[PDB]
mmCIF file of C-alpha atoms and ligand atoms in Angstrom:
data_model
loop_
_atom_site.group_PDB
_atom_site.id
_atom_site.type_symbol
_atom_site.label_atom_id
_atom_site.label_comp_id
_atom_site.label_asym_id
_atom_site.label_seq_id
_atom_site.Cartn_x
_atom_site.Cartn_y
_atom_site.Cartn_z
ATOM 1 C CA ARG A 6 -24.666 -20.158 26.785
ATOM 2 C CA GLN A 7 -21.066 -21.510 27.581
ATOM 3 C CA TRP A 8 -18.274 -20.548 25.131
ATOM 4 C CA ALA A 9 -14.544 -21.352 24.631
ATOM 5 C CA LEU A 10 -11.774 -20.385 22.083
ATOM 6 C CA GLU A 11 -11.659 -23.987 20.676
ATOM 7 C CA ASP A 12 -15.337 -23.602 19.488
ATOM 8 C CA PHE A 13 -14.191 -20.961 16.907
ATOM 9 C CA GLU A 14 -11.915 -20.785 13.806
ATOM 10 C CA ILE A 15 -10.051 -17.417 13.612
ATOM 11 C CA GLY A 16 -9.632 -15.565 10.271
ATOM 12 C CA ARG A 17 -8.734 -12.109 8.846
ATOM 13 C CA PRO A 18 -8.015 -9.257 11.333
ATOM 14 C CA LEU A 19 -10.938 -6.877 10.634
ATOM 15 C CA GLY A 20 -9.648 -3.872 12.642
ATOM 16 C CA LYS A 21 -6.955 -2.703 15.111
ATOM 17 C CA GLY A 22 -7.856 -1.660 18.672
ATOM 18 C CA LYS A 23 -6.412 -0.238 21.920
ATOM 19 C CA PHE A 24 -6.645 -3.245 24.342
ATOM 20 C CA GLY A 25 -6.896 -5.832 21.496
ATOM 21 C CA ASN A 26 -8.070 -6.297 17.869
ATOM 22 C CA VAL A 27 -11.205 -7.445 15.928
ATOM 23 C CA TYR A 28 -10.902 -10.707 13.926
ATOM 24 C CA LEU A 29 -13.211 -12.598 11.547
ATOM 25 C CA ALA A 30 -14.387 -15.864 13.164
ATOM 26 C CA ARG A 31 -16.459 -18.954 12.355
ATOM 27 C CA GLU A 32 -18.318 -21.082 14.975
ATOM 28 C CA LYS A 33 -17.436 -24.711 14.102
ATOM 29 C CA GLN A 34 -20.815 -26.340 15.052
ATOM 30 C CA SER A 35 -22.967 -23.878 13.042
ATOM 31 C CA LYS A 36 -20.442 -22.482 10.481
ATOM 32 C CA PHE A 37 -21.600 -19.034 11.799
ATOM 33 C CA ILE A 38 -19.473 -16.088 10.631
ATOM 34 C CA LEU A 39 -18.979 -13.397 13.308
ATOM 35 C CA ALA A 40 -16.495 -10.818 14.716
ATOM 36 C CA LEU A 41 -14.273 -11.471 17.750
ATOM 37 C CA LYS A 42 -13.037 -8.640 19.993
ATOM 38 C CA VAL A 43 -9.983 -10.192 21.671
ATOM 39 C CA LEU A 44 -8.971 -7.976 24.621
ATOM 40 C CA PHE A 45 -5.930 -8.826 26.843
ATOM 41 C CA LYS A 46 -6.689 -8.939 30.630
ATOM 42 C CA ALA A 47 -3.218 -7.441 31.412
ATOM 43 C CA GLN A 48 -3.877 -4.158 29.508
ATOM 44 C CA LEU A 49 -7.442 -3.833 30.980
ATOM 45 C CA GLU A 50 -6.270 -3.723 34.654
ATOM 46 C CA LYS A 51 -3.235 -1.489 33.768
ATOM 47 C CA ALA A 52 -5.724 1.327 32.808
ATOM 48 C CA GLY A 53 -8.740 0.506 35.077
ATOM 49 C CA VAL A 54 -11.378 -0.247 32.400
ATOM 50 C CA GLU A 55 -12.497 -3.727 33.693
ATOM 51 C CA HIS A 56 -15.773 -2.175 35.016
ATOM 52 C CA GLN A 57 -16.403 -0.225 31.730
ATOM 53 C CA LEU A 58 -15.957 -3.507 29.773
ATOM 54 C CA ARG A 59 -18.634 -5.089 32.028
ATOM 55 C CA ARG A 60 -20.856 -1.991 31.351
ATOM 56 C CA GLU A 61 -20.150 -2.457 27.568
ATOM 57 C CA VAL A 62 -21.175 -6.178 27.774
ATOM 58 C CA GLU A 63 -24.207 -5.414 30.025
ATOM 59 C CA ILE A 64 -25.433 -2.709 27.564
ATOM 60 C CA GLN A 65 -24.690 -4.303 24.113
ATOM 61 C CA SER A 66 -26.122 -7.767 24.994
ATOM 62 C CA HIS A 67 -29.612 -6.388 25.912
ATOM 63 C CA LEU A 68 -29.789 -3.923 22.956
ATOM 64 C CA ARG A 69 -31.614 -5.292 19.839
ATOM 65 C CA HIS A 70 -31.816 -2.977 16.759
ATOM 66 C CA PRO A 71 -31.028 -3.291 12.966
ATOM 67 C CA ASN A 72 -28.506 -0.384 13.346
ATOM 68 C CA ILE A 73 -26.727 -1.519 16.551
ATOM 69 C CA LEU A 74 -24.042 -4.247 16.365
ATOM 70 C CA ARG A 75 -25.402 -7.265 18.240
ATOM 71 C CA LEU A 76 -23.301 -8.813 21.040
ATOM 72 C CA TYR A 77 -24.154 -12.570 21.038
ATOM 73 C CA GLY A 78 -22.125 -13.516 24.154
ATOM 74 C CA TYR A 79 -18.709 -13.456 25.842
ATOM 75 C CA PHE A 80 -15.935 -15.596 27.397
ATOM 76 C CA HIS A 81 -12.315 -15.398 28.710
ATOM 77 C CA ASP A 82 -9.188 -17.513 29.390
ATOM 78 C CA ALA A 83 -5.885 -17.370 31.399
ATOM 79 C CA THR A 84 -4.769 -14.389 29.167
ATOM 80 C CA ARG A 85 -7.579 -12.639 27.166
ATOM 81 C CA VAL A 86 -11.315 -11.614 27.122
ATOM 82 C CA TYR A 87 -13.466 -12.371 24.045
ATOM 83 C CA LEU A 88 -16.548 -10.512 22.761
ATOM 84 C CA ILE A 89 -18.801 -12.474 20.329
ATOM 85 C CA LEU A 90 -20.096 -9.571 18.155
ATOM 86 C CA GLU A 91 -21.903 -9.520 14.793
ATOM 87 C CA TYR A 92 -19.809 -9.171 11.617
ATOM 88 C CA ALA A 93 -20.376 -6.084 9.465
ATOM 89 C CA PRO A 94 -19.673 -7.317 5.885
ATOM 90 C CA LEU A 95 -19.185 -3.871 4.301
ATOM 91 C CA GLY A 96 -16.683 -2.630 6.898
ATOM 92 C CA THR A 97 -16.346 0.753 8.619
ATOM 93 C CA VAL A 98 -17.743 4.185 7.622
ATOM 94 C CA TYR A 99 -14.140 5.426 8.370
ATOM 95 C CA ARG A 100 -12.684 3.507 5.370
ATOM 96 C CA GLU A 101 -15.880 4.293 3.309
ATOM 97 C CA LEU A 102 -15.114 8.012 3.956
ATOM 98 C CA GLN A 103 -11.327 7.693 3.334
ATOM 99 C CA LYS A 104 -12.074 5.985 -0.022
ATOM 100 C CA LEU A 105 -14.730 8.540 -1.223
ATOM 101 C CA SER A 106 -13.095 11.653 0.483
ATOM 102 C CA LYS A 107 -16.620 13.117 1.139
ATOM 103 C CA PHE A 108 -20.255 11.850 0.827
ATOM 104 C CA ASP A 109 -23.232 13.224 -1.159
ATOM 105 C CA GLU A 110 -26.325 14.814 0.516
ATOM 106 C CA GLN A 111 -28.260 11.528 -0.078
ATOM 107 C CA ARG A 112 -25.701 9.246 1.689
ATOM 108 C CA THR A 113 -25.157 11.764 4.529
ATOM 109 C CA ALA A 114 -28.945 12.067 5.208
ATOM 110 C CA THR A 115 -29.518 8.267 4.948
ATOM 111 C CA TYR A 116 -26.703 7.635 7.472
ATOM 112 C CA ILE A 117 -28.080 10.448 9.735
ATOM 113 C CA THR A 118 -31.647 9.003 9.882
ATOM 114 C CA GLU A 119 -30.263 5.445 10.429
ATOM 115 C CA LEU A 120 -27.983 6.692 13.275
ATOM 116 C CA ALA A 121 -30.807 8.862 14.747
ATOM 117 C CA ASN A 122 -33.250 5.851 14.680
ATOM 118 C CA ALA A 123 -30.655 3.752 16.542
ATOM 119 C CA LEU A 124 -30.030 6.643 18.969
ATOM 120 C CA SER A 125 -33.827 7.096 19.410
ATOM 121 C CA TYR A 126 -33.927 3.420 20.526
ATOM 122 C CA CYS A 127 -30.824 3.953 22.745
ATOM 123 C CA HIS A 128 -32.303 7.079 24.401
ATOM 124 C CA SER A 129 -35.733 5.377 24.936
ATOM 125 C CA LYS A 130 -33.853 2.801 27.109
ATOM 126 C CA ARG A 131 -31.845 5.786 28.582
ATOM 127 C CA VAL A 132 -28.482 4.597 27.105
ATOM 128 C CA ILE A 133 -25.831 7.074 25.811
ATOM 129 C CA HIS A 134 -23.036 5.962 23.424
ATOM 130 C CA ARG A 135 -20.907 9.175 23.851
ATOM 131 C CA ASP A 136 -18.227 7.981 21.346
ATOM 132 C CA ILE A 137 -20.160 8.490 18.094
ATOM 133 C CA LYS A 138 -17.364 8.493 15.444
ATOM 134 C CA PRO A 139 -16.861 6.863 11.951
ATOM 135 C CA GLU A 140 -14.412 4.408 13.657
ATOM 136 C CA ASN A 141 -17.428 3.054 15.686
ATOM 137 C CA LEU A 142 -19.940 3.043 12.808
ATOM 138 C CA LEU A 143 -20.129 -0.058 10.598
ATOM 139 C CA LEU A 144 -21.972 -1.274 7.476
ATOM 140 C CA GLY A 145 -24.201 -4.342 6.942
ATOM 141 C CA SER A 146 -24.849 -6.202 3.602
ATOM 142 C CA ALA A 147 -27.558 -3.677 2.611
ATOM 143 C CA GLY A 148 -25.050 -0.835 3.319
ATOM 144 C CA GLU A 149 -27.024 0.067 6.504
ATOM 145 C CA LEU A 150 -25.244 1.839 9.382
ATOM 146 C CA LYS A 151 -24.430 -0.208 12.545
ATOM 147 C CA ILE A 152 -23.282 1.312 15.892
ATOM 148 C CA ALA A 153 -20.424 -0.602 17.602
ATOM 149 C CA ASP A 154 -17.816 -0.304 20.463
ATOM 150 C CA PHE A 155 -20.130 0.546 23.403
ATOM 151 C CA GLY A 156 -16.963 0.957 25.646
ATOM 152 C CA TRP A 157 -17.700 4.550 26.800
ATOM 153 C CA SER A 158 -21.516 3.941 26.871
ATOM 154 C CA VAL A 159 -23.390 4.828 30.143
ATOM 155 C CA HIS A 160 -27.007 4.761 31.550
ATOM 156 C CA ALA A 161 -28.862 7.918 32.880
ATOM 157 C CA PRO A 162 -27.396 11.514 32.955
ATOM 158 C CA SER A 163 -23.843 10.641 34.153
ATOM 159 C CA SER A 164 -20.577 12.390 35.193
ATOM 160 C CA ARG A 165 -18.286 9.369 34.426
ATOM 161 C CA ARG A 166 -15.865 11.206 32.070
ATOM 162 C CA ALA A 167 -14.405 8.139 30.322
ATOM 163 C CA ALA A 168 -12.934 9.159 26.872
ATOM 164 C CA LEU A 169 -10.875 11.919 28.702
ATOM 165 C CA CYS A 170 -7.839 12.051 26.340
ATOM 166 C CA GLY A 171 -7.560 10.585 22.750
ATOM 167 C CA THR A 172 -9.397 12.525 20.009
ATOM 168 C CA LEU A 173 -11.960 14.962 21.420
ATOM 169 C CA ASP A 174 -13.290 15.811 17.891
ATOM 170 C CA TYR A 175 -16.685 14.165 18.683
ATOM 171 C CA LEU A 176 -16.992 14.955 22.452
ATOM 172 C CA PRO A 177 -19.356 17.892 23.299
ATOM 173 C CA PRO A 178 -18.445 20.931 25.512
ATOM 174 C CA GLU A 179 -19.988 19.260 28.659
ATOM 175 C CA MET A 180 -17.841 16.097 28.310
ATOM 176 C CA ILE A 181 -14.557 17.998 27.629
ATOM 177 C CA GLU A 182 -15.018 20.167 30.777
ATOM 178 C CA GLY A 183 -16.521 17.653 33.304
ATOM 179 C CA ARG A 184 -20.171 18.992 33.576
ATOM 180 C CA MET A 185 -22.824 16.181 33.804
ATOM 181 C CA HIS A 186 -23.823 14.945 30.331
ATOM 182 C CA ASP A 187 -27.105 13.357 29.070
ATOM 183 C CA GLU A 188 -28.720 12.162 25.740
ATOM 184 C CA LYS A 189 -27.791 15.528 24.070
ATOM 185 C CA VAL A 190 -24.115 14.355 23.838
ATOM 186 C CA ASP A 191 -25.108 12.108 20.881
ATOM 187 C CA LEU A 192 -27.061 15.021 19.254
ATOM 188 C CA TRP A 193 -23.775 17.036 19.290
ATOM 189 C CA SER A 194 -21.821 14.012 17.865
ATOM 190 C CA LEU A 195 -24.562 13.670 15.167
ATOM 191 C CA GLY A 196 -23.830 17.232 13.845
ATOM 192 C CA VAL A 197 -20.048 16.563 14.027
ATOM 193 C CA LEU A 198 -20.701 13.511 11.826
ATOM 194 C CA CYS A 199 -23.121 15.262 9.457
ATOM 195 C CA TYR A 200 -20.390 17.950 8.910
ATOM 196 C CA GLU A 201 -17.609 15.327 8.558
ATOM 197 C CA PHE A 202 -19.639 13.210 6.058
ATOM 198 C CA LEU A 203 -20.108 16.211 3.726
ATOM 199 C CA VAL A 204 -16.775 18.100 4.251
ATOM 200 C CA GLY A 205 -14.535 14.990 4.727
ATOM 201 C CA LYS A 206 -13.125 16.380 8.041
ATOM 202 C CA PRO A 207 -14.664 17.080 11.531
ATOM 203 C CA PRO A 208 -15.906 20.685 12.221
ATOM 204 C CA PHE A 209 -13.393 21.279 15.070
ATOM 205 C CA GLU A 210 -10.348 19.341 13.694
ATOM 206 C CA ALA A 211 -7.228 21.258 14.776
ATOM 207 C CA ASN A 212 -3.460 20.439 14.839
ATOM 208 C CA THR A 213 -3.199 19.970 18.660
ATOM 209 C CA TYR A 214 -5.346 18.834 21.671
ATOM 210 C CA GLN A 215 -5.383 22.301 23.363
ATOM 211 C CA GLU A 216 -6.149 23.776 19.884
ATOM 212 C CA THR A 217 -9.205 21.452 19.392
ATOM 213 C CA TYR A 218 -10.243 22.128 23.048
ATOM 214 C CA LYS A 219 -10.565 25.868 22.232
ATOM 215 C CA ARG A 220 -12.550 25.183 18.988
ATOM 216 C CA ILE A 221 -14.926 22.788 20.854
ATOM 217 C CA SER A 222 -15.370 25.182 23.879
ATOM 218 C CA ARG A 223 -16.026 28.259 21.700
ATOM 219 C CA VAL A 224 -18.032 26.087 19.161
ATOM 220 C CA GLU A 225 -15.996 27.631 16.301
ATOM 221 C CA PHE A 226 -16.652 25.946 12.891
ATOM 222 C CA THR A 227 -16.856 27.346 9.321
ATOM 223 C CA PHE A 228 -18.764 25.783 6.400
ATOM 224 C CA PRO A 229 -17.189 25.429 2.906
ATOM 225 C CA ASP A 230 -18.930 26.792 -0.246
ATOM 226 C CA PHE A 231 -20.250 23.304 -1.319
ATOM 227 C CA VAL A 232 -22.406 23.060 1.846
ATOM 228 C CA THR A 233 -26.172 23.526 1.266
ATOM 229 C CA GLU A 234 -28.341 25.975 3.320
ATOM 230 C CA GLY A 235 -30.419 22.918 4.484
ATOM 231 C CA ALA A 236 -27.233 21.093 5.560
ATOM 232 C CA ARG A 237 -25.797 24.302 7.194
ATOM 233 C CA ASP A 238 -29.116 24.745 9.140
ATOM 234 C CA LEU A 239 -29.217 21.142 10.572
ATOM 235 C CA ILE A 240 -25.499 21.369 11.574
ATOM 236 C CA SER A 241 -25.944 24.874 13.162
ATOM 237 C CA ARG A 242 -28.995 23.576 15.173
ATOM 238 C CA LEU A 243 -27.073 20.453 16.342
ATOM 239 C CA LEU A 244 -23.749 22.207 17.146
ATOM 240 C CA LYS A 245 -24.917 24.572 19.970
ATOM 241 C CA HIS A 246 -22.869 25.000 23.212
ATOM 242 C CA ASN A 247 -25.998 24.777 25.397
ATOM 243 C CA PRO A 248 -27.557 21.247 25.495
ATOM 244 C CA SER A 249 -31.197 22.472 26.037
ATOM 245 C CA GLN A 250 -30.895 24.476 22.700
ATOM 246 C CA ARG A 251 -30.102 21.242 20.699
ATOM 247 C CA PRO A 252 -33.229 19.541 19.194
ATOM 248 C CA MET A 253 -34.887 16.168 19.999
ATOM 249 C CA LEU A 254 -33.970 13.246 17.610
ATOM 250 C CA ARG A 255 -37.482 13.472 16.027
ATOM 251 C CA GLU A 256 -36.848 17.109 14.887
ATOM 252 C CA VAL A 257 -33.629 15.847 13.170
ATOM 253 C CA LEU A 258 -35.685 13.076 11.415
ATOM 254 C CA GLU A 259 -38.346 15.703 10.519
ATOM 255 C CA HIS A 260 -35.816 18.388 9.272
ATOM 256 C CA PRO A 261 -36.499 19.445 5.584
ATOM 257 C CA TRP A 262 -32.907 18.680 4.419
ATOM 258 C CA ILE A 263 -33.140 15.205 6.022
ATOM 259 C CA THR A 264 -36.492 14.202 4.396
ATOM 260 C CA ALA A 265 -35.579 15.761 0.997
ATOM 261 C CA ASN A 266 -32.269 13.841 0.863
ATOM 262 C CA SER A 267 -32.818 10.575 2.854
ATOM 263 C CA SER A 268 -34.108 7.122 1.695
HETATM 264 C C1 LIG B 301 -14.801 -5.977 4.354
HETATM 265 C C2 LIG B 301 -14.679 -5.651 5.810
HETATM 266 C C3 LIG B 301 -15.597 -6.030 6.791
HETATM 267 C C4 LIG B 301 -15.238 -5.597 8.056
HETATM 268 N N1 LIG B 301 -15.935 -5.830 9.212
HETATM 269 C C5 LIG B 301 -15.597 -5.254 10.423
HETATM 270 N N2 LIG B 301 -14.494 -4.393 10.513
HETATM 271 C C6 LIG B 301 -14.121 -3.773 11.658
HETATM 272 C C7 LIG B 301 -14.891 -4.022 12.809
HETATM 273 N N3 LIG B 301 -15.982 -4.845 12.741
HETATM 274 C C8 LIG B 301 -16.820 -5.184 13.792
HETATM 275 C C9 LIG B 301 -16.804 -4.701 15.232
HETATM 276 C C10 LIG B 301 -16.573 -3.396 15.653
HETATM 277 N N4 LIG B 301 -16.662 -3.330 16.995
HETATM 278 N N5 LIG B 301 -16.932 -4.563 17.456
HETATM 279 C C11 LIG B 301 -17.013 -5.415 16.404
HETATM 280 C C12 LIG B 301 -17.735 -6.039 13.147
HETATM 281 N N6 LIG B 301 -17.493 -6.227 11.814
HETATM 282 C C13 LIG B 301 -16.350 -5.468 11.595
HETATM 283 S S1 LIG B 301 -13.734 -4.756 7.844
HETATM 284 N N7 LIG B 301 -13.614 -4.941 6.295
#
């Protein structure tokens, strides 16, 4: 279980990050292709995220699902921290969306069930991702969804407001205004994503932070003409200010529009 930088051959930079980037890497002894999250120790302390990184490692290493990016192990040196994660061959859902502008009802529903199934596993172990966004969703060889970047992930109903600033597009009312958040946070993020996948943009996307804050707090979104009644229904049920009004993940999986359009 003991790793070092010299045991790997570094390749193409897969994606850009905040505290460090993701690179393609091969383990010399096995020829195993994987992803390396190189995070600089200096930037971690100068923001106070060292504990959240340990929470990320603690969570992701014990989680085992075909729609959750596996964390094989970790190591560090006199400068950086390294996360040995699985490599998603088909890239991010973010690029997939940028390329296609918007997705069809089939693709949206398939991604929704896949995400829900992975969240159903997460919530059965009482683990909340909180940062469910296309930037954190990846794609395997089969084109299957894969949840990554468990940085803001927490256990039990917590008050540890971590995302704070940055884009709030996917954070529910509870998270944006302190109030203790639970599993329902991901159910909100699910609707944000279902909307975004069909429309090409998030339901509350504004020009400023304070602008988006209003739209999230008042839950003010408007569907375009090309949005189906079935799609509109699922999104309306998911995007409710009150958490107890949002449905259980099984109801999402059961939903007519989901079953009629999924795979
Ligand atoms: C063709 C292609 C494949 C890509 N693969 C990946 N891109 C970005 C991030 N990736 C991770 C990852 C995310 N969080 N922790 C690790 C794993 N595989 C990737 S990109 N273009």
